[PDB]
Design a protein around this nucleic acid. Sequence first.
DNA 1: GTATTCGCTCTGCTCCTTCTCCCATCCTCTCGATATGAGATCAACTAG
Length: 50
Amino acid sequence: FIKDDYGPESRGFVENSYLAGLTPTEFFFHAMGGREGLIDTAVKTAETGY
DNA sequence: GTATTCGCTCTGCTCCTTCTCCCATCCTCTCGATATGAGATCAACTAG
């Protein structure tokens, strides 16, 4: 991306469906979001269990 | 003789420092590391 690109593509809007398939940038941004979910799931457990 | 201070003490108030505590449950597997006898004392015999 160009510098200072606040457009939807650049900042992680996946304009495709799962049937259409994600583009490589959409794939990476989606992996980032899913990683957030995985970290939350793996980090909340200790602190909720305590 | 009372102002007036004034030195000194008594808390007491924030704050910074220390220190001590805690950090889900359960389960499977692999892998590495991790002396000896002589003399003395005593007590049980073991008989005289």
